[PDB]
């Protein structure tokens, strides 16, 4: 209910900062969040690729 971005994955988020990976949907972070802006969404199922590219989880290697 907040697709105000362009390319897939990168979607609007009210709290940026840290995210998830192909091994940790949620990464610990004493900080809080980055200002509202287009970015990845771990709470949805998106992870960060070694190429620093946010991609769905099913888009991971074997």
From Swiss-Prot:
Superkingdom field: Eukaryota
CDD domains for the chain: TIL
Entry GO MF terms: serine-type endopeptidase inhibitor activity
GO cellular component terms, A-Z: extracellular region
Signal peptide span: none
Transmembrane segments annotated in the record for this chain: none
Disulfide bonds: 5-38, 15-33, 18-29, 22-60, 40-54
Cellular localisation: Secreted
TIL domain: residues covered: 5-60
Record keywords, A-Z: Disulfide bond, Protease inhibitor, Secreted, Serine protease inhibitor
Pfam families the record matches: TIL
Family: Belongs to the serine protease inhibitor-like (TIL domain-containing) family.
Record's protein name: Trypsin inhibitor
Species per Swiss-Prot/TrEMBL record: Ascaris suum
Lineage: Eukaryota, Metazoa, Ecdysozoa, Nematoda, Chromadorea
